[PDB]
Amino acid sequence: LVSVINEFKKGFQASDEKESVKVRKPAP
Amino acid sequence: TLRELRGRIRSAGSIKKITKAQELIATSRIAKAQARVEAARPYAAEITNMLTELAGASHPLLVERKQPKRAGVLVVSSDRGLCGAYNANVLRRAEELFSLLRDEGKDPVLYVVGRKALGYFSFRQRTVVESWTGFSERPTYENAREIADTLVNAFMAGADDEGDDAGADGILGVDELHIVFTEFRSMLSQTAVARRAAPMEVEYVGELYSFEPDPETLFDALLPRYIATRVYAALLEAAASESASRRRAMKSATDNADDLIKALTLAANRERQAQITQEISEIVGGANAL
Amino acid sequence: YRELEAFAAFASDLDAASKAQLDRGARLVELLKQPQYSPLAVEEQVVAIF
Amino acid sequence: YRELEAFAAFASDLDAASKAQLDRGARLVELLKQPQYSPLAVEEQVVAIF
Amino acid sequence: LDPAIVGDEHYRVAQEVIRILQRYKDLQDIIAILGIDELSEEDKQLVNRARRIERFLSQNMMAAEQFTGQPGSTVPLKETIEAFDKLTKGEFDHLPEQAFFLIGGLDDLAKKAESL
Amino acid sequence: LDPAIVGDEHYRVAQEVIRILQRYKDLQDIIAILGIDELSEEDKQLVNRARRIERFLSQNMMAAEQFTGQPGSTVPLKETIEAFDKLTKGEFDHLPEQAFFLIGGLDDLAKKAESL
Amino acid sequence: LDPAIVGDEHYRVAQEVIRILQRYKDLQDIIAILGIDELSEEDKQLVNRARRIERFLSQNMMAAEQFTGQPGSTVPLKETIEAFDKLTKGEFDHLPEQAFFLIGGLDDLAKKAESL
């Protein structure tokens, strides 16, 4: 029985906001 | 049978007592946590002021990338339960960030804090690269320090790594960093807020302290601790908001349990009266049938 | 003590007065129990309660 | 298994032995399904049980 | 109601629907006492689609013109079977609940979807 | 039962075990819904100890051996009191509860525990 | 109790008294253990006024006079409702509680305040 089970088990397939820094320098 | 009614009544009494105890502990917790966050505020103010002073006159992190391809995201969630919609809101915000990124077409790199968000991501088959855990509503500078270190190390490995090309930086480079967290501004309500950290811009406004002529080293030593302070503040805000939400939810639970107890009591009373009438009718009929 | 028995889980966070009341109630409720076939004299009872 | 499944609900973590017991119970419950008007011989019954 | 008479198409759909309804009725107590947050993700989605199915099961009447003043409708069986199969598979997740209320055919449901 | 008639260790063991079982019952009444994490360390310790206690309290029987397929046994009184004292102490916390089912004595406990 | 019978003012003042008492009961329930220092100023003003109100409900009875020797009093309704209306907006809270602990009327209140 266990031999047959092992034989069959291999032959069966399986179905399965944002952040900004602050700088005091006037804008270029 | 009325035995089930009695069991339900006693169970409901027990749960309502537990709920009131929990909500009282929760309001005490929010009282003691507001003090901690307001005491943490001045150091953050000092750090911001000194950083702005340093940036006044005089760093790959401050230079944008030519062609971004990926974007990193952080999620924060409560380690415990009994918090109404607290995780739901931040997960909604994360989902709409994902939608915006799909519109832009840049793939996300996920980072998670807290067990609930990790569990949610597990069932939806979304890969997680790093999962910090161990928060217990009371944070400390150590967790923020290590998280910031890991994130800044990861992002610095994205410059020579132009996305697909595993250059000198190494694979898994990231072009943009973003943060999702719950913001607490008033006890009445709180709102989830997204943000970004790695990209930056210089804001110009109209207008002695000095040091050695190396300001780049100062910036490179101040930015990581800036990020650490930012995530520390985010953690404090998250803890406060979680505690407030827990208080509200627990109060709602008690107010939902009490009337259920009342209805069960009414049903038990009517059942008892019906039973009494039934047996008295049966016995009087048997007696006068003779 | 009867009313404040639910807070045993979080006894660390409670106030000092609450902790003192809880401890006094515990000691009192421990004091009352007695073994059977052992009547007590009134002087002994008064001294014990005091 | 039926008594333990209720306790296992809303459990954060479980031992490997416990989850193995749940898996075995689930398999055993699944195996016992049977449609109407499908008599089965004793030999196939014992083979399936084994 | 059996595969011999009705057929194999109706049976599985009906069994799945009744299973979903039974699970929802089992969970309703914990839903009432605390809410929907305590449940797992799969149970949450099961509850959501159970609510959708329950709301959709109502149909606009024929003799209610005295009261509602909205003409009724009649539906062929195959349309119902396909609609319920799709509902069980869960292809109407993003739609609001209010649409599944006295609509009859699924075409009217699709039309009412954009009405909101 | 009386400390004067039977003895003091027997009485103290019985009192301890019955108190533990009562505490487990009114703790389970709430933990069945609120979850395990809602309690402190002492409560979880008591719950685990009580679970082991009710598991170990069963035994195999003479006249029912045909259903089990394995003959039963009997145990001395001193062994029972010593084993239950040890259980109340909290030493067997390292073993799974499945070893305590349908057991007799303590050597059988050791054999079954080593069998897993 | 109906404004159609006892007039508008009586029903009004009763309404404010009842609402104040309920609010104070809620506050007392929620601040019994946490601590008074955790509250705001409005809650403290409300609790002070509620304490004044509940103290003022005491009276002087001749049952007490049988022992103390201070004769009881009978208070006409008009000045009673006037006093309650005034106290609902009054500054009496700055007086000590022992003044309001028990009293026979407005003049008795004034004399008790003068004596302290």
Side-chain angles (χ1 to χ4, degrees), chain A residues 1-15 17-28, chain B residues 1-65 68-102 104-136 138-141 143-171 173-174 177-206 208-215 217-290, chain C residues 1 3-50, chain D residues 1-2 4-50, chain E residues 1-7 10-15 17-69 71-116, chain F residues 1-15 17-28 30-40 44-77 79-106 109-110 112-116, chain G residues 1-7 10-14 16-25 27-28 30-36 39-41 43-47 49-69 71-77 79-116:
Chain A
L1 268 184
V2 68
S3 70
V4 169
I5 293 312
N6 296 296
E7 286 166 33
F8 183 52
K9 68 183 184 186
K10 57 181 72 60
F12 177 49
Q13 51 88 13
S15 85
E17 294 98 2
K18 52 178 65 67
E19 56 95 18
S20 72
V21 68
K22 169 67 57 175
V23 171
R24 283 88 52 82
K25 175 200 165 300
Chain B
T1 183
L2 54 87
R3 313 182 266 185
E4 210 286 330
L5 277 297
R6 259 82 164 175
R8 283 221 184 95
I9 284 156
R10 51 187 57 99
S11 68
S14 60
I15 62 170
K16 71 180 292 294
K17 314 162 51 63
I18 289 301
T19 53
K20 314 183 311 323
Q22 268 300 322
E23 62 88 19
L24 276 152
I25 301 303
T27 178
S28 164
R29 176 86 259 179
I30 81 167
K32 80 199 305 187
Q34 189 53 57
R36 202 187 193 222
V37 58
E38 68 88 19
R41 280 179 170 90
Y43 183 43
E46 300 140 19
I47 292 290
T48 311
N49 296 321
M50 61 79 71
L51 185 138
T52 50
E53 164 59 57
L54 287 186
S58 284
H59 65 66
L61 189 48
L62 317 183
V63 182
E64 286 289 327
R65 307 268 179 82
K69 189 264 290 182
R70 304 185 266 232
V73 288
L74 268 291
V75 194
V76 295
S77 67
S78 68
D79 186 72
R80 289 177 56 192
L82 297 173
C83 61
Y86 175 77
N87 316 295
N89 189 13
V90 286
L91 270 296
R92 296 274 179 71
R93 295 316 304 272
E95 281 299 329
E96 63 90 16
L97 272 296
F98 301 138
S99 87
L100 170 63
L101 265 294
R102 296 285 78 76
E104 185 63 70
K106 324 317 297 185
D107 58 291
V109 189
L110 203 56
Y111 294 79
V112 64
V113 169
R115 287 190 182 98
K116 306 309 182 305
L118 172 56
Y120 157 87
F121 282 131
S122 82
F123 293 101
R124 305 290 85 84
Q125 293 75 50
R126 172 83 64 112
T127 61
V128 296
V129 60
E130 168 67 37
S131 160
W132 286 272
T133 301
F135 194 34
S136 81
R138 211 224 47 74
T140 195
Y141 195 35
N143 308 118
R145 269 195 332 276
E146 54 91 17
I147 277 169
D149 292 329
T150 300
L151 271 295
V152 300
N153 185 325
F155 185 82
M156 295 298 102
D160 305 63
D161 176 89
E162 53 267 13
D164 63 296
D165 178 78
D169 280 353
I171 201 63
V174 164
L177 295 178
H178 315 305
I179 305 93
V180 179
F181 76 107
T182 316
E183 191 276 329
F184 161 75
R185 81 283 187 273
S186 189
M187 183 177 177
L188 265 70
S189 71
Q190 300 88 348
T191 61
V193 171
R195 215 69 65 76
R196 61 174 177 82
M200 61 79 71
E201 73 272 16
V202 184
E203 205 267 335
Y204 324 110
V205 288
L208 206 63
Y209 182 76
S210 69
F211 275 101
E212 292 184 351
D214 51 339
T217 65
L218 263 64
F219 272 135
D220 282 33
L222 182 50
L223 288 182
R225 49 185 182 174
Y226 194 12
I227 307 301
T229 50
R230 283 299 308 275
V231 304
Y232 183 65
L235 291 161
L236 302 180
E237 288 280 326
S241 198
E242 153 180 350
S243 301
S245 79
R246 185 156 315 150
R247 159 171 172 166
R248 283 213 293 277
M250 292 295 337
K251 185 186 313 301
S252 60
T254 318
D255 296 333
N256 286 16
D258 55 0
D259 53 8
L260 184 134
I261 304 179
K262 180 67 174 66
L264 293 181
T265 302
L266 264 180
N269 265 280
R270 73 168 51 93
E271 165 59 40
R272 166 188 58 106
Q273 293 184 30
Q275 183 66 41
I276 299 291
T277 56
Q278 203 293 349
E279 69 252 7
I280 190 169
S281 61
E282 190 277 331
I283 184 54
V284 69
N288 64 7
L290 189 62
Chain C
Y1 173 62
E3 64 162 351
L4 272 181
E5 63 94 18
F7 291 160
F10 300 99
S12 62
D13 190 52
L14 275 297
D15 187 292
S18 51
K19 299 169 190 170
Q21 289 171 358
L22 198 67
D23 303 333
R24 281 283 299 276
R27 305 299 208 283
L28 260 68
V29 76
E30 213 279 339
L31 181 144
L32 274 296
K33 68 94 174 179
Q34 273 306 291
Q36 70 180 359
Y37 287 7
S38 184
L40 269 299
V42 296
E43 301 81 11
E44 293 179 354
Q45 296 178 357
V46 163
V47 161
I49 299 167
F50 151 81
Chain D
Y1 170 58
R2 297 327 281 279
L4 190 151
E5 64 181 359
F7 178 85
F10 295 152
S12 58
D13 164 57
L14 283 167
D15 183 33
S18 173
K19 68 184 291 183
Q21 191 174 351
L22 279 72
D23 186 82
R24 274 271 291 193
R27 305 296 157 73
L28 277 156
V29 167
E30 194 78 15
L31 180 73
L32 290 154
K33 308 286 212 328
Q34 182 167 354
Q36 189 176 1
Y37 291 132
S38 306
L40 200 59
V42 289
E43 304 87 1
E44 308 156 301
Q45 271 178 53
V46 64
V47 161
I49 298 298
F50 167 78
Chain E
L1 203 65
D2 72 327
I5 297 176
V6 185
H10 296 81
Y11 204 80
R12 41 182 189 98
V13 180
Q15 298 300 350
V17 162
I18 304 304
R19 197 258 320 279
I20 299 304
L21 271 295
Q22 185 73 15
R23 193 71 189 115
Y24 185 44
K25 188 183 76 66
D26 265 332
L27 276 170
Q28 75 90 31
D29 172 75
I30 302 308
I31 288 306
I33 190 66
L34 291 173
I36 61 173
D37 282 26
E38 289 82 5
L39 303 179
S40 69
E41 317 281 325
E42 325 305 317
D43 268 340
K44 275 196 275 221
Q45 88 182 2
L46 185 137
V47 167
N48 278 129
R49 65 181 65 189
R51 298 184 69 79
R52 304 304 175 76
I53 281 172
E54 178 52 71
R55 293 184 40 76
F56 178 79
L57 192 63
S58 66
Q59 188 187 335
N60 180 212
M61 271 305 327
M62 201 56 38
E65 300 324 294
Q66 316 165 356
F67 301 157
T68 61
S73 167
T74 187
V75 185
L77 183 48
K78 271 68 54 184
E79 175 163 358
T80 79
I81 297 312
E82 293 174 352
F84 275 112
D85 166 76
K86 280 200 191 308
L87 272 181
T88 48
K89 273 151 186 177
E91 277 80 9
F92 300 142
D93 45 1
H94 49 286
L95 278 297
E97 293 185 355
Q98 290 83 319
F100 305 79
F101 204 110
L102 306 163
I103 204 66
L106 62 94
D107 45 352
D108 198 11
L109 191 146
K111 169 65 218 70
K112 195 162 146 195
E114 62 258 9
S115 63
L116 298 177
Chain F
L1 61 83
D2 190 359
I5 289 180
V6 166
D8 62 283
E9 295 83 7
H10 197 168
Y11 201 92
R12 75 188 71 256
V13 163
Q15 298 320 103
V17 300
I18 197 160
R19 187 195 54 87
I20 278 170
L21 294 174
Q22 186 79 57
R23 195 82 206 79
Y24 165 68
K25 187 198 69 52
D26 43 358
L27 274 185
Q28 83 173 359
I30 185 65
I31 194 166
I33 290 313
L34 266 295
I36 322 294
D37 59 355
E38 282 296 304
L39 318 177
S40 176
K44 309 187 198 175
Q45 179 182 180
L46 189 150
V47 172
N48 304 323
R49 284 180 172 177
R51 290 273 282 189
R52 308 284 160 78
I53 289 300
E54 71 253 8
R55 288 278 191 286
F56 170 82
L57 202 76
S58 47
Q59 208 200 3
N60 54 8
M61 291 195 48
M62 291 315 78
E65 64 91 21
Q66 63 275 23
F67 310 145
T68 71
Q70 195 264 329
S73 63
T74 68
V75 288
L77 169 60
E79 306 313 308
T80 53
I81 66 174
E82 290 143 354
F84 269 128
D85 180 74
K86 195 41 146 163
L87 263 169
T88 52
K89 191 55 62 58
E91 190 272 332
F92 294 125
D93 306 335
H94 65 292
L95 296 176
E97 65 279 353
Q98 288 77 4
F100 294 101
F101 197 45
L102 273 297
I103 200 66
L106 188 153
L109 292 173
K112 168 162 281 267
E114 294 307 316
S115 72
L116 308 189
Chain G
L1 207 75
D2 193 0
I5 303 302
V6 297
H10 203 206
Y11 184 90
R12 292 194 319 264
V13 300
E16 290 90 7
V17 164
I18 290 303
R19 174 203 63 249
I20 285 295
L21 287 200
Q22 278 293 110
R23 171 74 267 181
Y24 159 69
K25 279 218 299 178
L27 284 191
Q28 163 265 333
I30 70 159
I31 76 168
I33 315 300
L34 308 173
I36 308 103
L39 283 75
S40 87
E41 67 277 17
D43 300 326
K44 296 178 178 67
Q45 191 248 350
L46 259 59
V47 66
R49 286 187 55 262
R51 282 175 292 168
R52 305 313 165 149
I53 294 293
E54 63 92 20
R55 288 307 209 286
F56 213 78
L57 268 297
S58 298
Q59 207 166 345
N60 306 317
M61 284 73 74
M62 60 287 289
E65 183 267 308
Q66 181 161 205
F67 295 159
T68 300
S73 63
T74 61
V75 189
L77 182 58
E79 83 271 24
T80 308
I81 77 175
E82 195 269 352
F84 273 127
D85 170 75
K86 170 60 172 60
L87 169 55
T88 45
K89 282 82 65 180
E91 297 80 3
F92 301 89
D93 56 354
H94 74 267
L95 279 77
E97 290 281 2
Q98 207 56 251
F100 310 108
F101 179 53
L102 59 85
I103 211 71
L106 287 154
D107 302 340
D108 281 329
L109 177 55
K111 304 332 310 173
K112 271 295 299 304
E114 286 324 292
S115 60
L116 314 182

